[PDB]
Amino acid sequence: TDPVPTGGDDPHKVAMLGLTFDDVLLLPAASDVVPATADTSSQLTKKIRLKVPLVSSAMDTVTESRMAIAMARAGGMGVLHRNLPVAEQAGQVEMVKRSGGLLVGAAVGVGGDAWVRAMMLVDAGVDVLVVDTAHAHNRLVLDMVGKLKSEVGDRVEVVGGNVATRSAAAALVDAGADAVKVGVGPGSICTTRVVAGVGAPQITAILEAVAACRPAGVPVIADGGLQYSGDIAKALAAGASTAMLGSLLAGTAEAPGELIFVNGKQYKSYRGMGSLGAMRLVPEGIEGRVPFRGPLSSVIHQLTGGLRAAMGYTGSPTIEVLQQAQFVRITPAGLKESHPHDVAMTVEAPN
Amino acid sequence: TDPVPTGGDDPHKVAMLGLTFDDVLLLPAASDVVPATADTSSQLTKKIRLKVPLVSSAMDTVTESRMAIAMARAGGMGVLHRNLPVAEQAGQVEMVKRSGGLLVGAAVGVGGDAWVRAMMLVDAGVDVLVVDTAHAHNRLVLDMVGKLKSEVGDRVEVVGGNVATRSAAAALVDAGADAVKVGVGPGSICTTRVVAGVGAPQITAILEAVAACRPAGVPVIADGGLQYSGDIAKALAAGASTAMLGSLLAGTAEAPGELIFVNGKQYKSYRGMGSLGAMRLVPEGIEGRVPFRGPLSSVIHQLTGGLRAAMGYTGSPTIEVLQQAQFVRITPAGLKESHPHDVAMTVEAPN
Amino acid sequence: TDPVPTGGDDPHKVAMLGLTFDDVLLLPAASDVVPATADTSSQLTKKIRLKVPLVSSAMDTVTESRMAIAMARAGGMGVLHRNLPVAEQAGQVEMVKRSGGLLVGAAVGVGGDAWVRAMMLVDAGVDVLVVDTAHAHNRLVLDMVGKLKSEVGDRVEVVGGNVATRSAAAALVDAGADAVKVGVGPGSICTTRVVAGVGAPQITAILEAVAACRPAGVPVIADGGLQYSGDIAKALAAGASTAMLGSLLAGTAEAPGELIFVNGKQYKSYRGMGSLGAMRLVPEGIEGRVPFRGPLSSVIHQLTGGLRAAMGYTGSPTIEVLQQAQFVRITPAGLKESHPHDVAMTVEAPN
Amino acid sequence: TDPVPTGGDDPHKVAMLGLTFDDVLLLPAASDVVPATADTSSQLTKKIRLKVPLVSSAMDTVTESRMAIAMARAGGMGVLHRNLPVAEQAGQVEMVKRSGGLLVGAAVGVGGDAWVRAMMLVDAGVDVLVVDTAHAHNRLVLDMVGKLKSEVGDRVEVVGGNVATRSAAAALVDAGADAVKVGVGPGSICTTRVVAGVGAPQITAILEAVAACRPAGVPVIADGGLQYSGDIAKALAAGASTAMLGSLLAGTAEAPGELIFVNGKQYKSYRGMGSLGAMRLVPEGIEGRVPFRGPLSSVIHQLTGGLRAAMGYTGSPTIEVLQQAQFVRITPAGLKESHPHDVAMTVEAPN
């Protein structure tokens, strides 16, 4: 019997061909939609629907109270980071709620300290708890999701993550998750892929997770690797219901941290929560910077405008119809020309 | 049942593998043709044939009256842009017609203002109206094509675009188009692919559009992404009858705009019609510059000379025979060496 | 009958599609393992098991007595290079043994001088002889392995290499090898691939060698091409039992050679044993430098920490279970973003 | 019926997947050969065998009398260029013959002037005439080959080229060619691929030409695209019997032209015969420079040493056995690391 063409005799050892955002484009289709008439609302969890399908990352250079307030007023939501004392994180929940009863989420870990943290966040009025781990396919993480749903599931929605396979998504569904968050390795500041050699390209990861979550009516959050407004449309077309953003929002005025004027240009700090500086395990993130991008409200306008364009091109009046759109796969020659190919750019572009 | 190897259980979710110009080369074939004896004429529309199968883009940094006159004298045609008052665009049609009864086209949009614009262009003597949109697969665009053909179709030829699929091309054929223009996302100044995440590699887009248009006798115009004279031969071999050029003609003396002397070299401005500067919707084009290339007549000579070489290599005495030629697909290793590989270039090359 | 799509009529002329480390990632799986509880021990040979599955290369800029002592104290082993007089190499074996009865190996060639060298190394107390060649699929190399096993196989373990195919691995098994070393062409300082045009991508080479060695109970050593801690996890998941490292250990304090302070940064020399300088045949290696990395103990801690992370993600409590893990294949678009994509790195990272 | 996945309904429109040298490596195999015992002789034509399987290109910056003498003394042969008067080219043939009865070839074109040129070269004692064209699949080129074989075929061997397909090779065989030269588009100074859009990756081109020529006993010359000594071994393993070199020999002392000292380094001019400067048709080559490489004898020693290494690794005692070797295909990740990957090179390498 002949060998597998990539080696050995086991045809499942190399189990899939993984695609990322840069591997695909959305195909145009018959349309009665123009960008102005599209409806961008979508489910975050079983019980919570957002006007704009975007949430901010649970990172100490992205989301504290100011970012959470701005995201909710823009039609989305923030998830408050957990690298601070319990009493401080609960106090930031209260600040958001005192600003008009806006929606807000907060991250917790696994264990006894995470349990006390969760209970205080619920008492402060949080709307969504996010069980926030690098590898949710573990009975200890699944147990935390189920116990929270048992104790406080009548008062708050419970998200679990992160996963990158169909079987891991199915395990979170069976544990009672109200939404499943997808992304192992794709983040802009991530080094898991080179430190551990572990990961999963995000378009294939979303397609596989959706195959378990959609038949059960559980929404999927696409978390990490989004670099452009067009990546939001690709993630939702693959079947996700919302997208979580770190790098694209870290440059805004509302993100924590001070402006950095260096060599006449302006930047802000952005770092992984598994970086050496955040942990103070071998590190699995870097510490860096991103260009300054101005007010959050202006960034969200550009991002939703790109999503609305995609809905016009694909004939999608709602996000539920966008989830039925088709892709074409592209080669390396097709990608390299999508970044403005061969024209000395002379003026600024907002998107 | 086993999953699709790229994810999920739907084998049509990723519907095709899209090829662009850099993915293919034309195979040599048995030949009684040398470059001097080839015939480059081809249909622009059902009723109009050109001596050279090239038209200039409807852009305010490419085609006004001077470019339209030069293109017609060289054996091709210009399409006048529509980012100016109706009375000014109609006046430029008259200037061209006063220069020897040369052929000329003009762009119009969709709606009531576009209707008055179209009627004035017809009164001024235009030969071709181009219904000029980003996404022609919409009943409002199809309706405009059909109404123009109904009202003035005896006096003028009507083109519709742009499309990138077989089903969209078929819809324009059924609406009565005299030619179908292909290109969603491929232009050198385009950012649709990153802003909306939407597009289609141009060799596959032409192959699919031709599968609908050729059986109906409707010519296809390949619009956008052509970077070299060899790309013209590839587009026509895929089944197109003419090609539309922006970047390759924006550097010429006849294009609108002033020379730019910077750092001892010379350039000219070139910008998308969906850029912030042209629109004065989130932008879907950039504003930039290209190197100065001299007189139009000299550029067209180099472009047609490359096409004539391809006709010799493939044994094609006419464009209709070139449309029957075959491709070989190449890998990333093959492309990277096609741009002069590993020889410090010391002298200028005209093509 | 139709041709093979890549040319000719022989479907076995291009016999396989070869994958390297950068072509694959490990998929996360169901897990009861966290990095702290993983067990990293593994077989070097039939009779020798290591606490950490890493050995240092037999190169005159990587392993003499100081490196061999440090590797053994860290739980791995060193292989002493053979570019020095027999009496000097045997003396370095004694120095290691005088430092606590630590484990040590030593390289030998093929022929009569290599035979006297081997006998002196055995008298000095070496634990492992490595028959060290560029192409072990030769009866002269197979003969050396068998004769050593016949004469001294009761006192010492005998490794043979290097190979890159299933048939070559099977020949070493039949000759009596206690372990088989895999790698023809992959090393960081290797030029065999461009000088001779010969090689085999290392993930496919390991998969093929394991298909012959695992059914016979013979461990496989993955030798060359490892650039990151994650590559260790990939090599072992493909079926290898240990990995051999040159570049990743050449920068350490214990490697032979003096520090190089140039332009404010620090480096150390690193060269192939088939380079012109080492041979003093056309050369098949280069002479270069690598950044200084500090104490060996600190480098091994970072490398094993990355391996432990991979064991947590894949649910592997032992190396024998890691050898059963699955891969996903990635495209060029997926790789280019795994090296920290689009975030100006500002702080140092240890791994 | 479903479409072809790359577009349209014709499965032969994209007819093959073309591989170049960088797409493949030679697999090691069972061997009783070391580099010193290999035999590198091979047929140039039906009646002429060379000791080293290499010829120099017919270019006015590569081969005049000095290069032809040095190539013959090294065991190969030169082909004299034809961009000079007939009386001068015939005089250079005589100079070579006066230096010891060495072997020599000379290029001619097609037509009446080429006929007089050919007759004078034969009277001067040339051993091989090369009918030298860009596209030999034409009855006018086939006619020239047949007429020369009819008139002078008893006294001289007749080569025809260039071709890139099985059908074109078969046509030259039927016309009576004594050898067939393969290469449309691959040369380092070629711009045919971008000017005309025409070409064929060279490993696939050789495989296809050999499928026609080997059953007829007609040797194949691989012409263009060879960048490293390892590329010679790849070309011969694909079935060619000799290789023709331009860039790799243009830097030598014996090549025509003067040394160029610029910025402390030394270069020499190298240009295509279809460049603007050589023709004094749109140009299909560039004018450039290459690094100075010293005496020819030293370059040929390095090239044959790399070939001998490949023969050891593949178990080939003769070139006829090397023509039976197997390839593994590699990905972009495998190639990028074959050029010395990630080690600051500090010393010079001869190959």
Ligand SMILES: C[C@H](Nc1ccc2ncc3c(c2c1)CCOC3)C(=O)Nc1ccc(Cl)nc1
């Ligand atoms: C469930 C458990 N969660 C915690 C929470 C707080 C801790 N606080 C302090 C310490 C430990 C803690 C573990 C364990 C190590 O000793 C100190 C845990 O295993 N988490 C974990 C393990 C490995 C990796 Cl890679 N990532 C995360």
Ligand SMILES: C[C@H](Nc1ccc2ncc3c(c2c1)CCOC3)C(=O)Nc1ccc(Cl)nc1
């Ligand atoms: C994302 C999380 N990993 C870490 C790792 C190190 C940390 N070090 C310090 C701090 C935090 C850390 C979180 C969180 C914020 O407070 C400081 C994580 O994967 N947990 C986890 C829990 C249980 C299981 Cl079974 N597997 C994994």
Ligand SMILES: C[C@H](Nc1ccc2ncc3c(c2c1)CCOC3)C(=O)Nc1ccc(Cl)nc1
């Ligand atoms: C050190 C490392 N720190 C973080 C922190 C936050 C993260 N947030 C999101 C993601 C990752 C994160 C890693 C990694 C995967 O991509 C998503 C971490 O906890 N490693 C880890 C390894 C194995 C297992 Cl069993 N448990 C945990």
Ligand SMILES: C[C@H](Nc1ccc2ncc3c(c2c1)CCOC3)C(=O)Nc1ccc(Cl)nc1
């Ligand atoms: C058919 C229709 N054409 C026009 C023409 C002129 C207009 N002039 C002014 C304004 C509008 C106009 C629309 C609409 C917005 O309000 C101001 C239109 O929908 N075109 C359109 C919509 C969305 C996108 Cl992305 N691209 C183009």
Ligand SMILES: C[C@H](Nc1ccc2ncc3c(c2c1)CCOC3)C(=O)Nc1ccc(Cl)nc1
């Ligand atoms: C190409 C065209 N898009 C735009 C967009 C914004 C513009 N903004 C300003 C101006 C122009 C603009 C054209 C044209 C020139 O005058 C100024 C377009 O796609 N129209 C269109 C019409 C109907 C439908 Cl259903 N879908 C799309």
Ligand SMILES: C[C@H](Nc1ccc2ncc3c(c2c1)CCOC3)C(=O)Nc1ccc(Cl)nc1
């Ligand atoms: C803002 C944007 N402006 C332009 C202007 C001219 C163009 N000309 C040609 C092409 C494109 C163009 C885009 C985009 C696709 O490639 C071809 C545009 O109108 N967006 C748009 C989006 C969705 C829908 Cl339903 N309607 C229109």
Ligand SMILES: C[C@H](Nc1ccc2ncc3c(c2c1)CCOC3)C(=O)Nc1ccc(Cl)nc1
């Ligand atoms: C088995 C044999 N081993 C030795 C050992 C020591 C030597 N010492 C000196 C010399 C030779 C030696 C050969 C042979 C050449 O003359 C001088 C040998 O053939 N090894 C070899 C051959 C070709 C290549 Cl590429 N790599 C390695």
Ligand SMILES: C[C@H](Nc1ccc2ncc3c(c2c1)CCOC3)C(=O)Nc1ccc(Cl)nc1
């Ligand atoms: C790795 C080994 N190749 C070389 C080549 C040249 C050398 N030149 C000088 C020195 C050494 C060399 C080793 C070793 C250290 O001493 C100096 C090798 O492949 N041997 C080998 C033996 C038998 C057969 Cl059948 N095939 C190959």
Ligand SMILES: C[C@H](Nc1ccc2ncc3c(c2c1)CCOC3)C(=O)Nc1ccc(Cl)nc1
């Ligand atoms: C000159 C060259 N020198 C070395 C030295 C050490 C090496 N160590 C490991 C590896 C290689 C090495 C090459 C090359 C393949 O990758 C693994 C060598 O001996 N060439 C060689 C060629 C053909 C045959 Cl039959 N015998 C030997």
Ligand SMILES: C[C@H](Nc1ccc2ncc3c(c2c1)CCOC3)C(=O)Nc1ccc(Cl)nc1
């Ligand atoms: C067979 C024929 N050979 C010659 C030879 C010498 C000539 N000398 C002068 C001139 C011509 C010549 C043609 C033809 C053009 O007028 C001047 C020819 O057609 N060769 C040719 C044609 C096109 C291309 Cl692309 N490459 C080569």
Ligand SMILES: C[C@H](Nc1ccc2ncc3c(c2c1)CCOC3)C(=O)Nc1ccc(Cl)nc1
């Ligand atoms: C390689 C050859 N092409 C050229 C083109 C232009 C030239 N211009 C000037 C000169 C030479 C030229 C050769 C040769 C040297 O003298 C000066 C060629 O393909 N011929 C050819 C002949 C017959 C047919 Cl049917 N097809 C093609």
Ligand SMILES: C[C@H](Nc1ccc2ncc3c(c2c1)CCOC3)C(=O)Nc1ccc(Cl)nc1
């Ligand atoms: C202008 C151009 N000049 C050269 C000269 C020497 C060459 N030598 C070798 C090769 C090529 C060469 C092109 C091109 C293909 O690759 C091999 C040439 O003659 N074009 C040409 C085009 C079509 C036809 Cl029918 N006839 C000839």
Ligand SMILES: O=c1[nH]cnc2c1ncn2[C@@H]1O[C@H](COP(=O)(O)O)[C@@H](O)[C@H]1O
């Ligand atoms: O240190 C880390 N390593 C890996 N992933 C991380 C780390 N910190 C945060 N993440 C993930 O990266 C996401 C942000 O990715 P980005 O939007 O591509 O910048 C977060 O929402 C987390 O899921």
Ligand SMILES: O=c1[nH]cnc2c1ncn2[C@@H]1O[C@H](COP(=O)(O)O)[C@@H](O)[C@H]1O
């Ligand atoms: O802003 C824009 N976005 C996208 N495509 C555009 C825009 N403006 C013009 N185009 C298209 O780009 C073509 C020119 O492409 P190029 O020849 O590759 O420079 C035009 O003929 C239009 O079809």
Ligand SMILES: O=c1[nH]cnc2c1ncn2[C@@H]1O[C@H](COP(=O)(O)O)[C@@H](O)[C@H]1O
């Ligand atoms: O000159 C040489 N050419 C090719 N491979 C070599 C040479 N010297 C050593 N090697 C191999 O390269 C390995 C180290 O590779 P690295 O860890 O990628 O730097 C060694 O363990 C040998 O197997």
Ligand SMILES: O=c1[nH]cnc2c1ncn2[C@@H]1O[C@H](COP(=O)(O)O)[C@@H](O)[C@H]1O
């Ligand atoms: O102007 C030209 N265009 C294309 N190919 C050329 C030209 N001049 C020479 N050649 C070919 O290029 C080969 C040399 O290629 P190289 O060895 O890769 O530099 C010659 O032997 C010819 O077959």
